[PDB]
Each structure stands twice: as structure tokens, then as C-alpha cells.
Amino acid sequence: SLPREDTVYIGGALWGPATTWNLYAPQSTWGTDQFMYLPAFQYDLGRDAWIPVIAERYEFVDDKTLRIYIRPEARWSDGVPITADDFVYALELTKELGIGPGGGWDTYIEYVKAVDTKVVEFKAKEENLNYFQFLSYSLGAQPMPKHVYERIRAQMNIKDWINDKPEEQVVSGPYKLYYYDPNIVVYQRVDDWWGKDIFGLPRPKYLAHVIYKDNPSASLAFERGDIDWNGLFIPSVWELWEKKGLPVGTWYKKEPYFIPDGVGFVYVNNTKPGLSDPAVRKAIAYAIPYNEMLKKAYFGYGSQAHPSMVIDLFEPYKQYIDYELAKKTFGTEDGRIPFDLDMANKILDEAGYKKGPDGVRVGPDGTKLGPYTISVPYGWTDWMMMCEMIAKNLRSIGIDVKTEFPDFSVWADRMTKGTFDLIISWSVGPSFDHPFNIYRFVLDKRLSKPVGEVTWAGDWERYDNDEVVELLDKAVSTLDPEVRKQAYFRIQQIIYRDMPSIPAFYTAHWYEYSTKYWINWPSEDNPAWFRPSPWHADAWPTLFIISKKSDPQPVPSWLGTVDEGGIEIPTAKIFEDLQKAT
Ligand SMILES: OC[C@H]1O[C@@H](O[C@@H]2[C@@H](O)[C@H](O[C@@H]3[C@@H](O)[C@H](O[C@@H]4[C@@H](O)[C@H](O[C@@H]5[C@@H](O)[C@H](O)O[C@H](CO)[C@H]5O)O[C@H](CO)[C@H]4O)O[C@H](CO)[C@H]3O)O[C@H](CO)[C@H]2O)[C@H](O)[C@@H](O)[C@@H]1O
Numbered sequence: 094s095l096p097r098e099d100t101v102y103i104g105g106a107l108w109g110p111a112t113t114w115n116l117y118a119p120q121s122t123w124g125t126d127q128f129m130y131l132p133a134f135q136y137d138l139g140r141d142a143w144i145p146v147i148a149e150r151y152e153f154v155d156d157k158t159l160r161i162y163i164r165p166e167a168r169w170s171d172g173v174p175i176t177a178d179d180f181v182y183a184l185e186l187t188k189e190l191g192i193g194p195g196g197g198w199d200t201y202i203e204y205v206k207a208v209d210t211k212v213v214e215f216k217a218k219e220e221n222l223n224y225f226q227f228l229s230y231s232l233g234a235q236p237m238p239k240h241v242y243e244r245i246r247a248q249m250n251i252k253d254w255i256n257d258k259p260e261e262q263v264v265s266g267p268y269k270l271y272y273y274d275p276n277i278v279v280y281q282r283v284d285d286w287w288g289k290d291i292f293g294l295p296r297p298k299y300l301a302h303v304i305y306k307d308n309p310s311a312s313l314a315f316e317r318g319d320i321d322w323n324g325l326f327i328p329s330v331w332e333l334w335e336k337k338g339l340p341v342g343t344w345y346k347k348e349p350y351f352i353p354d355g356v357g358f359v360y361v362n363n364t365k366p367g368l369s370d371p372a373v374r375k376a377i378a379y380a381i382p383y384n385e386m387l388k389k390a391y392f393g394y395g396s397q398a399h400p401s402m403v404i405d406l407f408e409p410y411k412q413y414i415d416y417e418l419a420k421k422t423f424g425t426e427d428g429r430i431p432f433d434l435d436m437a438n439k440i441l442d443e444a445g446y447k448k449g450p451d452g453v454r455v456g457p458d459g460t461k462l463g464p465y466t467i468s469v470p471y472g473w474t475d476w477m478m479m480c481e482m483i484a485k486n487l488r489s490i491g492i493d494v495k496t497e498f499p500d501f502s503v504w505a506d507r508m509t510k511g512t513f514d515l516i517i518s519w520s521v522g523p524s525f526d527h528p529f530n531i532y533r534f535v536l537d538k539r540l541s542k543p544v545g546e547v548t549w550a551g552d553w554e555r556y557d558n559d560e561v562v563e564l565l566d567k568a569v570s571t572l573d574p575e576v577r578k579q580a581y582f583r584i585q586q587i588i589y590r591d592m593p594s595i596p597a598f599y600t601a602h603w604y605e606y607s608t609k610y611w612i613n614w615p616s617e618d619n620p621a622w623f624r625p626s627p628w629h630a631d632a633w634p635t636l637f638i639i640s641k642k643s644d645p646q647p648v649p650s651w652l653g654t655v656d657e658g659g660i661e662i663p664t665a666k667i668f669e670d671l672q673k674a675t
């Protein structure tokens with residue numbers, strides 16, 4: 094019985110059943126990290142700047158010692174001040190449990206310390222100095238309510254906690270859980286949210302996500318007015334407003350329709366026999382029908398990824414790509430991997446793989462290129478079609494691969510515990526520290542977990558390489574772009590030699606909106622926020638920008654850099670202060 098005009102309905106973000114609202118549980122429900130728990134600083138990709146959220150400012154004591162000053166007003170939804178202890182607690186608990194927000198912080202942060210009630214101090218580990226990770230883990234730190242979690246641990250194992258009682262939920266964001274069941278999850282605004290004076294209140298009173306079983310059923314809901322804020326794959330999206338005259342839109346009104354989200358991989362499990370062979374993984378890369386699948390299945394909503402894992406859609410990242418290495422390795426104009434079944438077969442043949450009587454390859458060690466599955470969640474129709482196309486080409490070269498589409502939760506379980514064979518999945522996207530962020534996420538064994546244990550922090554494929562570790566530990570030991578560049582170049586050599594997993598395409602930042610009840614959605618025309626997809630980790634400002642149709646509100650005054658009248662701090666200003674602290 095939600096008030097329609099005060100409720101935003103979402104699609105494409107919650108798939109499968111709600112799980113928990115505990116960022117320390119094996120899985121959590123859409124909306125938890127996004128809306129319930131905010132960071133010290135929120136990175137703004139669109140402006141390359143940082144919103145001071147829970148924190149109001151930083152100070153470098155020296156270039157390796159950063160203090161973060163918590164806003165006095167910053168307060169949990171139960172009224173308990175957010176304090177430096179909350180920041181310490183969150184990170185220490187993640188280290189203890191092997192899971193949780195800020196995973197891997199202890200690798201690059203020496204300590205996090207509460208030097209006063211509203212002052213946290215982060216110190217960079219010197220032995221493997223990395224300024225990017227130092228800044229990422231500190232500025233982006235998410236506190237967690239120590240007074241809440243401690244009570245929980247005295248009562249039960251933290252990992253088993255569901256956090257599903259609305260009246261008990263304690264959050265730092267402007268929303269918390271209102272109600273849920275097998276068919277829906279609903280969030281309600283916290284009207285006396287601590288950030289009310291500084292940021293204003295977000296305009297929707299409720300966020301509601303009906304749980305749709307698949308793309309077509311969600312698409313129907315969208316076409317009939319039942320979804321305001323969508324993060325869906327939609328075939329021929331333009332026809333919604335052209336042909337059908339519906340009041341809906343996307344970021345772009347013409348071709349690509351969507352801004353890029355990141356890099357979609359064909360992930361290949363390194364621990365499986367056959368798939369453990371780099372030659373087999375290389376052959377898989379040549380058997381992906383990149384252009385045909387991206388045009389047919391993906392509607393040109395995204396294009397083929399560069400094998401360097403660098404997102405070359407953005408000109409500033411191109412410098413981090415060794416183009417002559419990539420061109421020399423793959424023999425194409427830009428160094429992308431070409432679809433070529435002849436080469437995939439040749440790679441297999443020269444690695445000693447020979448088709449048995451049933452067509453399926455057997456290695457020189459007797460390893461059969463197996464019954465394997467390629468898996469994506471049920472209902473994700475574009476990825477399913479791509480899986481069918483990839484699997485067919487693999488079967489033709491003697492790699493026995495069939496598709497399998499379990500519920501999201503099952504799919505996520507096998508992905509994170511590393512029991513899959515092949516999957517399509519995401520990685521990371523554009524960022525201040527990008528190409529490093531993707532190498533850290535995809536290639537770093539330190540972020541992985543043993544087979545059978547959940548990891549959301551990275552390296553689902555369980556790639557194991559000590560040299561990459563050394564390279565990342567050196568990559569940003571100084572701010573000199575040249576040092577970073579050279580480390581990226583050696584990593585790219587390693588990627589081509591090992592093919593740990595295949596960077597296939599640039600994922601679309603699925604984002605559609607209806608203007609039936611809500612207006613001023615971000616778009617190319619209204620570029621107020623550059624991560625507006627409802628499922629994105631950084632979607633929350635979107636809710637502060639939109640207005641009810643019956644009562645338009647202006648775009649928030651805090652958006653924009655300090656020099657433009659806003660409160661956001663350019664990444665350039667931060668590195669300037671770092672440099673000045675030497
Ligand atoms: O084109 C293909 C189809 O794409 C669909 O959209 C995709 C979109 O739904 C997907 O969303 C991602 C969310 O599933 C993801 O979910 C988050 C969980 O990962 C997160 O786990 C946390 C973990 O990050 C943290 O470290 O610790 C916690 C341990 O407990 C753990 O819970 O929980 C989050 C809430 O707390 C939850 O939101 O979050 C990702 C963001 O980081 C989302 O991106 O992303 C794809 C990216 O490519 C989208 O394609 C469309 O809906 C379909 O129509 C398409 O067919």
C-alpha cells in the first residue's frame with residue numbers, strides 16, 4: 094500500500110531472493126551497501142572529485158599518514174554519534190572474518206587508529222608502499238556501527254546475522270529496510286537522517302524493488318509504468334520512446350544508449366583440470382565471437398574490451414596500454430584479440446591437444462577438455478545468449494561446454510566460492526586509480542579465497558601469481574606516472590602469457606528511467622551524476638537529484654567542485670596535498 098507518488102520502483106538490481114542486510118554475511122541484499130552504509134568520502138567518477146560525506150575534511154600529516162575528520166553531525170540512525178571507533182571496528186572486523194567492506198586494507202594500510210572521537214588516522218604500510226590503495230581504503234572507508242555489531246557477536250556468529258528487523262536496523266545512510274517478502278524489498282527514508290542539513294533529504298520516501306523472475310517480465314513492468322528507475326538489459330531500448338511513445342529515457346538518446354560500467358569477463362576457473370592450462374584459456378579468447386555477439390545479443394550497447402584490461406573508451410587511460418606489445422601479440426590494428434577459430438584450433442594443436450573419438454580434446458597428459466559449464470544467472474537474457482554463442486564455438490574446437498542458468502544466488506555462490514568452470518561476470522570500471530583497480534581486482538591472489546570459501550573482493554578465478562603481487566606492490570611506490578606505466582606494461586605481458594581470464598566486452602551501465610512520477614533524472618542532457626544505475630555501488634546521489642513531477646526541486650547545491658560552488662574535492666587537489674606533504 095505504498096504511496097505511489099512518494100515511491101520509486103526499481104528494476105534490474107535485485108535478482109533472486111533477499112538474503113541479508115549484513116555486509117559481513119556471505120551474501121547481502123541490493124540496497125544495503127548502496128543506501129544503508131555511506132563512506133567517509135564518496136568518489137565522483139563524473140567529476141573526478143570526492144564528496145565529503147561522513148567525513149568533512151582530511152589532512153596529510155605526512156605523505157604516508159592521513160587523518161580524516163568525521164563530521165560532528167554524523168550520527169547513526171539510532172542517535173549514536175558516528176565515531177573513529179566505528180571506522181577502526183569496521184576494518185578490523187573485515188580482517189578478522191576474512192570478509193566485509195574494505196577487504197585487503199591490511200595489505201597496504203599499516204594501521205587504522207582512533208586518535209580522537211571524530212578523528213581517524215590511517216598510516217600507509219611502507220614495505221609495499223601504494224599511494225592509490227592508501228588513498229582508496231582511507232578516503233573510501235565505510236564505518237560500521239560498533240555498538241550494534243558487538244551486541245550481535247555476544248549473541249551469535251556475525252556471519253549468520255540477517256539484520257532484517259526494520260526497527261533494529263542502524264544505518265548511516267538516508268534509507269533502511271521497511272518491509273520484504275519473496276516478491277519484493279522495500280526501503281523507507283530516514284526523515285531525521287544526520288545529513289539532512291548538509292545534503293538535504295532524498296526526495297523519495299520509499300525505494301521498492303519487485304522481484305521479477307527475468308528480463309522480459311521486468312521489461313513489461315517498465316513498459317506499463319511500474320518501474321521508475323531501471324537497471325535492465327532491454328532489447329531495442331529506443332523503441333520504447335520512439336515507436337511506443339512511452340515517457341521513458343536513457344543516458345544517451347542515440348547509439349550506445351548507455352555509458353560504460355566496466356569490463357565484463359569470460360572468467361575461467363584456474364583450479365580446474367584443462368582450464369588450468371594457459372594455452373586452453375588463450376584458445377578460449379580466440380573463440381569468442383566478439384563482434385557478432387556484441388551486435389546481436391548485446392545490441393551494440395557495449396564494445397569489445399582491450400585484452401590489457403584497460404578501458405580504452407576513455408582517452409586518459411590509453412597511455413597505460415602497451416599498444417605495440419598488444420599489436421605484436423595479436424596482430425590487429427589496436428591489439429584486440431580477433432575472433433578466429435583457426436587460431437584457437439592451432440593454439441590447441443600446438444599445445445598437444447587432440448580430439449578424441451567424441452570430438453572433445455585430450456591433452457598430452459591425458460586431461461580431457463572436460464564436461465564444463467558456462468554459467469550466468471537465469472533471466473539475464475543478453476548474457477544467456479552470449480553464453481550460448483560462446484559455448485557453441487567452444488564445442489566446435491573440442492572443448493565440451495554447455496550452458497547452465499541457475500538462480501542469481503546459486504550463481505553468485507559458485508562464482509564467489511570458485512566452484513564454477515566458466516562464467517561471464519563483471520570486474521571493475523573507470524576510477525581515479527584505473528588500470529590498477531582492475532589488476533588488483535582480477536589478478537591478485539591476496540583478494541582471493543580457497544575454493545569453497547566466499548570472496549567478493551576479487552580473483553574469483555583463483556589465479557595464482559606472485560610476480561603480479563610484487564608488481565602491484567611497486568606500481569605506486571611513487572607518484573611518478575612512468576613507474577605506474579611500466580608496472581602496467583609488465584602486467585600486460587603476464588596477462589597475454591597466462592590469459593588468467595578473458596576481458597571480453599565493456600559492460601553497459603544499465604540505466605533507464607520513467608518520467609511518470611519522477612523528473613530531472615541524470616542523463617547526457619542533465620549530467621548531474623555519472624553513476625545513476627540503481628545497482629551501482631555509487632548510485633545514492635541520484636535520489637537527491639530527482640524530484641517529484643508534481644513539485645520540481647532544484648539540483649542540490651553541494652554537487653560540483655569547491656571552485657564551482659559545490660563541496661566536492663578534485664582528485665588533483667588531493668594529490669597536490671600529498672605532494673606538498675613531503
Ligand atoms: O546484462 C546482464 C544483466 O545485467 C543486469 O544488471 C547487472 C546488475 O544487476 C549487477 O549488479 C551488481 C549486484 O549484483 C552486486 O550486488 C551487490 C553484491 O555484490 C554485494 O555483495 C557484497 C560485497 O560487494 C561486499 O564486499 O561485502 C558483502 C559481504 O556480505 C557483500 O554482500 O552486496 C550488495 C548490497 O550490499 C549488492 O548490491 O553489486 C554490484 C555493485 O558492486 C552490482 O554491480 O551488475 C552487473 C554489472 O555488470 C549488471 O550487469 C541486468 O539487470 C539484467 O537485465 C541483464 O541481463
Ligand SMILES: [Ca+2]
Nearest residue numbers: 126127130131
Ligand atoms: Ca556503501
